[PDB]
Design a protein around this ligand. Structure first.
Ligand SMILES: Cc1cc2nc3c(=O)[nH]c(=O)nc-3n(C[C@H](O)[C@H](O)[C@H](O)COP(=O)(O)OP(=O)(O)OC[C@H]3O[C@@H](n4cnc5c(N)ncnc54)[C@H](O)[C@@H]3O)c2cc1C
Ligand SMILES: Cc1cc2nc3c(=O)[nH]c(=O)nc-3n(C[C@H](O)[C@H](O)[C@H](O)COP(=O)(O)OP(=O)(O)OC[C@H]3O[C@@H](n4cnc5c(N)ncnc54)[C@H](O)[C@@H]3O)c2cc1C
Ligand SMILES: CC(C)(COP(=O)(O)OP(=O)(O)OC[C@H]1O[C@@H](n2cnc3c(N)ncnc32)[C@H](O)[C@@H]1OP(=O)(O)O)[C@@H](O)C(=O)NCCC(=O)NCCS
Ligand SMILES: CC(C)(COP(=O)(O)OP(=O)(O)OC[C@H]1O[C@@H](n2cnc3c(N)ncnc32)[C@H](O)[C@@H]1OP(=O)(O)O)[C@@H](O)C(=O)NCCC(=O)NCCS
Lengths: 555, 554
C-alpha cells in the first residue's frame, strides 16, 4: 500500500473509530482528525447520567483524551478546529482555529466526514427569551444544564419530546429530586415501540410521579420560559426546559460541496461509504443507511452503527472490501427507572406505512425459572411474516433479562433466522439465568404456531369490535382472576373445566378465547380446534388488554 | 385417526413430549408412567433448596399430578416402574412400587425418557458410609436436608467438581458448612479449560472452599467420617456428596435388545427413533451428536431434553419434521459471585480429536466503564484459523455473562463465523453494553488472527519461548506493574514505543504483552508495519498471572 494523507472531520463515535483502525492498518499514513469542540471521544450516551449525578466524575465522560490518543495512534488531532468548507476539486478543506481565529487550507487524499447530527430546535414563540431552556448534545451543554440545576435550584422541569433520550432525561431529573412533566405530540413515549408496549412504560413512569402530557405541544413559551403554553390551551409552570425532539444530520459541509444528499438531508453514500465524490467518505448519524430488514433508505442515529461504520470504513479504505455494511437493524435500549425497554427492526407503525403484511405475538415469560428467587416478567413482542417466518422486528420490556433477550433476537435477525429457528436456539440454562425453554424460545414457539397454522389469533385492538359483531368470547381464567377485571362480553369457563363443559360452547358462533397471559387461551384454542370448532386466541390475553385499554375494563 | 402413546418418565423429556402431544391431538390416549412420587419436579433447583435459597419446598414441584392430568387429559401414573419392554407383543410390564405387583400395558407408540442415574464408584467402605449422599430427585434432597438438620454437620466433602458438584459446594458453604472439594482432575468444571478454571479456583478459595486436585478417595473409614485420599491426606468430615457424573438409564432399551451408543446410551436416529420403529427415546438417556463436529456423545442437560420432547411430539403428530441437529452443549453455573458458561467444544476435546484451532481471550466490561458498576466479562473463543468456524466458547465474570454466552451460542447454531461476530448489532446504552459489545470485541480479536493482522502465543507457551531466544516487551504503563510481570519482560509502555523503536532488536522474534491483551495487539500492529516479526501474548499478564501465579516475577 502507498501511504496517503487522510483527514477526518469530527472526533467522536465515527471519527475516532475510523482514525484508530486506520493507524492500526498503516504506520505511514498521515492521519488528521479535526474537531470543533474541545473534546474527542466523549461519552455522548453518558451525558444524561452525569446530569442526574449517577455518573459522579465528569472526567469519566472522556473515553480518550487528545494527549493520550494522539500519542498512542500518532494522530494529528486538532480540537477547537472547525471545518468551514470543503473544496472538493482542489482536494482541500478550510479549517478555522476557534481559539486564535486563524484560518487555513488543508490538503487531503482521502476526506472522511463524521460530523454527526444536531438537535432540532423548534420555532416556538418565546424560545429566544427562554432563559432556562436547554438542548443536550455535547459536554458544554451538559456543564450548562448541571450548573443551572446546582446554582438555580429548579423544583420543576419540563421535557419536550419523549424519545429514548427525552425519557432518560426525565429519569435523571427525577433522580436529582426535580419534579418532571413530559410533553409529547404523539400518543405515546418512545416512537420506536408500538402503542400497547408504550402503555407499560407509561405506567412505570407515572409510578415514579412523572406527569405525562400526550397529543399536545408547546404553543408558546411565556414569562421567559417560566410559563409553557400548550397547543391545547393548558399551561405548565416550570423552572427549566429540556428540548429532546430529535436530531437532524449535519450535512451543511456536504450541501456546500455539492455532494448528493439522501433522505431527510442525510449525506448519501454507496455500499463503501463513498459520497458522490470519489475521495470523500461519510459515516455516522449524518448518513443515509438502509434498514437491515427491508433495505429501505432511512436515518438511524445510534452509536453501535457509527462505531461499526468507522471501523469498517478503515478496512474499506485499505481495499479490504470482502465485508460491506449490511444496513442498520436499529437495535436500541433504554433504562426507564426500574424498567428496561428494548427494540430492534421495525414496529407495526412502520410496517403499515410500508404496506407489508405481518403478524404479531405478545409473550410474557419469566426472566428465569419461577422456583428460583427474584424471577421477573419479560414481555416480548415479535413481529413476523406469516408465510416465510421472516422476522420484521421485536420489542421487549421488563425489570431484568431484557437486554439479553433483545440481543439474542437481534442476533437471530442479522443471522437471517426465521421465527421457526427461535425455538431451536440452545441458550444458557441454570435456575438463576433462564428456564428450560428461554423466553426467546417461548416467543419463537408462539410465532411458529401461527406460521404453522396451529392457532389463529386476534389483537387487543380487535376484540371489542368482534364481540360487538357477535363474537363469542370465552374467558378461560379461574373465576377469582376475574376480579382483576375482564373484557366486555366475556363468558367464564376455566381452562381446566372446559373439556368437561364443551356442551356450553356454541357450535353456531365464532369462538374467541382469552386468558390472563395468552398461554392458557392458546391451550384452550388447540383443544377446541381439535374438537372441530372455529376458534381464535386473544394475543396477550387480559393482562395486555387491561394495560392498553384500562378504561374499557369490565369489573 | 387415533393412537395409544405410552411415555416412560414423567419429568423433563416425558412431560414435555406428553403436553405437546395433547395439544396436537385430542383423540390419542396418552399414558405417562413415572416410578417416583412426583412429575415435573425442578431437578435443577435441588441444590438451592438444600442451600436455603429456595426456601419453599413446594416451589420444587412445577406441575402437580392432578392438575396436569386434568389440563391435558393425561393418564399419569406415579409410583409405577416400567420393568420390561415387550417389543414383540408391543406391551410393557409395569410394577406398582408400593405393592410390588405388576401388570401389562399395550402401546401403539412407546417413548422412553428415563434420564440418567448417579455414578457410584467402588470405594472401600462406601457401604458403611452413613452420611454419603447422591443427588437426583426430591427424596434424595429431603434426605440430605434431614441429615443436615438432625446431625448439624460442621464439614462436608464433595467428590467431583463438575457444574453440579460446584453448585453443592456453594449451597453447603452458604449454610455455614465447611467444604472440601475432591477432584480427580487438575481443575474443577471439565467443560471449561484449565486457564479459565484458574479464575473459578481463586474465587472458590476466596470463599473458603478447600480445593483438592489430582486426588481421589481410596477408602472411607469410621463410617464415612474419615476420608482416606490417594495422596495420603486424610479428611475428617460429617457428610459426603457424590457428584462424579451420571450414566444413562438405558436398562429398558438394553433389556429389549435396542441398539446402544456411547457410554451405554440409547442409540437413536435424527427423529429420536430407536432400532425399533415403534419405540422412541429422548433426554439424558440418548446418544446425541455434538452440533459442532457431529461426534457421537452424551450431554445430559435440560434445554436439550425439553427441546427433544417438543420436537418429538411434532414428529409424531405435528407438521413437517424438523430434525435434531445435535446438542451444542450450552451450559452455565452460578459459582458464588461468579457466573461460568460454556458452549461447543473446549481445547481438551479439540486436541483429543486432533482438530487444528486457535483461541483468543478477551476481557471486556459488562457495560461501558464510564457508567457505575461495570464488571469484567472474560470471553474465550475457540475457532478455525482458515474458515473462522467457531468450535466453542467459554465465559466468566460477575454479571452480563449469560447474555454474552447466549449471543455466541445463537451465532454458532446460526452457522456464523468469528468474522460475523463484529457485525452483530446488539443493545447499547450505558447500563447494558458498549459501542462495541464484548461479543463484537472477541469477534474482532479472532478476526484479526483469521485475516493475518496479528499472530499470537498462549499463556502456556510464553515461558518456553523466552527461555529459547524470544524477546518479550511489556507495553503496560509502569503503574500497572503492581501485580508483577512475566519472567524476562522488558517494559516499554505502548505510548512510548513508537519513539523508542531503536530499543527493539530487529533480528529477533518479538513478543508483546499488556495487561488484558488489547494494547499488546496495538503494539504488535505497529511493530509489524515497521517490519518486525512479532506475536501478541493472548490475554496479557492478567490471564498469565491468574493461571501461573507461582511463575510471576516482581
Ligand atoms: C444525550 C445523548 C444520549 C445518547 N445515548 C445513546 C445511547 O444510549 N445509545 C446509542 O446507541 N446512541 C446514543 N446517542 C447517539 C450517539 O451519541 C450517536 O449515534 C453517535 O455519537 C454518532 O456518532 P457520530 O460520529 O456520527 O457523531 P458525533 O458523535 O456527534 O460526532 C460528531 C462530531 O463532529 C463534530 N463536527 C461537526 N461538524 C464539524 C465541523 N464542521 N468541523 C469540525 N467538527 C465538526 C461535532 O462537534 C461532533 O463532536 C446519544 C446521543 C445523545 C445526544
Ligand atoms: C441436581 C441437578 C441439577 C441440575 N441442574 C441442571 C441445570 O442447571 N441445567 C441443566 O440444563 N440441567 C441440569 N440438570 C440435568 C437435568 O435435570 C436433566 O438433563 C433433565 O432432567 C433430563 O431430562 P430426562 O427426562 O431425560 O430425565 P429426568 O428429568 O431425570 O426424568 C426421568 C424420569 O424418569 C423416571 N424413570 C426412569 N426409569 C423409569 C422406569 N423404568 N419406570 C418409570 N419411571 C422411570 C425417573 O424416575 C425420572 O423421574 C441437573 C440435574 C441434577 C440432578
Ligand atoms: C413444564 C413441562 C411439563 C412442559 O409442559 P408445557 O405444557 O409444554 O409447558 P411450557 O410452558 O413448556 O409450554 C408452553 C406452551 O404454551 C405456548 N405459550 C406460552 N406462552 C404463550 C402465550 N403468551 N401465547 C400463546 N402461546 C403461549 C408455547 O408456545 C408452548 O406451546 P407449544 O409447545 O404447543 O408451542 C415440562 O417442561 C417440565 O416438566 N418442566 C420442568 C422439569 C424440567 O425441565 N426439569 C429439568 C431439570 S430443571
Ligand atoms: C474508543 C474509540 C476511539 C475506539 O478506538 P479503538 O482503538 O478502536 O478502541 P476499541 O476498544 O474499540 O478497540 C477495538 C480493537 O481492540 C482489539 N481488542 C480489544 N480487546 C482485545 C484483547 N483483549 N486482545 C486483543 N485485541 C483486543 C479489537 O480486536 C479491536 O481491534 P481492531 O479494531 O484492530 O480489530 C471510539 O469507540 C470512541 O471514541 N468511543 C466513544 C465515543 C462514542 O462511541 N460515542 C457514542 C455515544 S456513546
Amino acid at each position: 500500500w502507498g501511504s496517503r494523507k487522510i483527514v477526518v472531520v469530527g472526533g467522536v463515535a465515527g471519527g475516532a473509530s475510523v482514525a484508530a483502525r486506520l493507524r492500526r492498518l498503516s504506520e505511514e499514513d498521515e492521519i488528521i482528525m479535526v474537531e470543533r469542540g474541545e473534546y474527542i471521544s466523549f461519552a455522548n450516551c453518558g451525558l444524561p447520567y452525569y446530569i442526574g449525578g449517577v455518573i459522579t466524575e465528569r472526567q469519566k465522560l472522556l473515553v480518550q483524551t487528545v494527549e493520550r490518543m494522539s500519542k498512542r495512534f500518532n494522530l494529528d488531532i486538532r480540537v477547537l478546529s472547525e471545518v468551514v468548507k470543503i473544496n472538493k476539486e482542489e482536494k482541500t478543506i478550510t479549517i478555522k482555529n476557534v481559539t486564535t481565529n486563524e484560518t487555513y487550507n488543508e490538503a487531503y487524499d482521502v476526506l472522511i466526514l463524521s460530523p454527526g447530527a444536531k438537535p432540532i430546535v423548534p420555532s416556538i414563540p418565546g424560545i429566544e427569551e427562554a432563559k432556562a431552556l436547554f438542548t443536550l448534545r455535547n459536554v458544554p451543554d451538559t456543564d450548562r444544564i448541571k450548573a443551572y440545576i446546582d446554582e438555580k435550584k429548579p423544583r420543576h422541569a419540563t421535557v419536550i419530546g419523549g424519545g429514548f433520550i427525552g425519557v432518560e432525561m426525565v429519569e435523571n431529573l427525577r433522580e436529582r429530586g426535580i419534579e418532571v412533566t413530559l410533553v409529547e405530540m404523539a400518543n405515546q413515549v418512545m416512537p420506536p415501540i408500538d402503542y400497547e408496549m408504550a402503555a407499560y412504560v407509561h405506567e412505570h413512569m407515572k409510578n415514579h410521579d412523572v406527569e405525562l402530557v400526550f397529543e399536545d405541544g408547546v404553543d408558546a413559551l411565556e414569562e421567559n420560559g417560566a410559563v409553557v403554553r400548550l397547543k391545547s390551551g393548558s399551561v405548565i409552570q416550570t423552572d427549566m426546559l429540556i428540548l429532546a425532539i430529535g436530531v437532524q444530520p449535519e450535512s451543511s459541509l456536504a450541501k456546500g460541496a455539492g455532494l448528493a444528499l439522501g433522505v431527510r438531508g442525510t449525506i448519501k453514500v454507496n455500499e463503501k461509504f463513498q459520497t458522490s465524490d470519489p475521495h470523500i467518505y461519510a459515516i455516522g448519524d449524518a448518513i443515509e443507511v438502509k434498514d437491515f430488514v427491508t433495505e429501505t433508505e432511512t436515518m438511524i442515529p445510534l452509536a453501535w452503527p457509527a462505531n461499526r461504520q468507522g471501523r469498517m470504513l478503515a478496512d474499506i479504505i485499505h481495499g479490504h472490501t470482502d465485508s460491506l455494511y449490511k444496513g442498520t437493524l436499529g437495535t436500541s435500549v433504554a433504562k426507564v427507572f426500574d424498567l428496561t425497554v428494548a427494540t430492534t427492526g421495525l414496529n407495526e407503525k412502520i410496517l403499515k406505512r410500508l404496506n407489508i403484511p405481518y403478524e404479531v405475538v405478545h409473550v410474557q415469560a419469566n426472566s428465569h425459572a419461577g422456583y428460583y428467587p427474584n424471577a421477573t416478567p419479560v414481555l416480548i413482542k415479535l413481529i413476523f411474516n406469516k408465510d416465510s417466518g421472516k422476522i420484521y422486528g421485536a420489542q421487549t420490556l421488563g425489570r431484568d433479562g431484557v437486554d439479553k433477550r433483545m440481543d439474542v433476537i437481534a442476533t437471530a435477525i442479522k443471522a437471517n433466522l426465521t421465527v421457526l429457528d427461535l425455538p431451536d436456539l440452545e441458550l444458557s440454562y441454570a435456575p438463576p439465568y433462564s428456564s428450560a425453554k428461554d423466553p426467546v424460545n417461548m416467543v419463537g414457539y408462539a410465532a411458529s404456531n401461527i406460521v404453522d397454522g396451529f392457532v389463529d389469533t386476534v389483537q387487543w385492538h380487535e376484540i371489542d369490535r368482534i364481540v360487538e359483531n357477535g363474537g363469542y368470547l370465552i374467558d378461560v381464567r379461574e373465576p377469582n382472576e376475574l376480579k382483576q377485571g375482564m373484557i366486555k362480553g366475556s363468558i367464564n369457563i376455566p381452562l381446566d373445566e372446559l373439556r368437561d363443559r364443551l356442551e356450553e360452547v356454541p357450535v353456531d358462533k365464532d369462538i374467541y378465547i382469552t386468558c390472563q397471559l395468552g398461554m392458557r387461551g392458546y391451550v384452550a384454542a388447540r383443544m377446541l380446534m381439535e374438537k372441530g370448532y372455529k376458534v381464535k386466541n386473544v394475543d396477550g390475553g387480559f393482562k395486555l388488554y387491561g394495560t392498553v385499554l384500562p378504561e374499557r375494563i369490565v369489573y
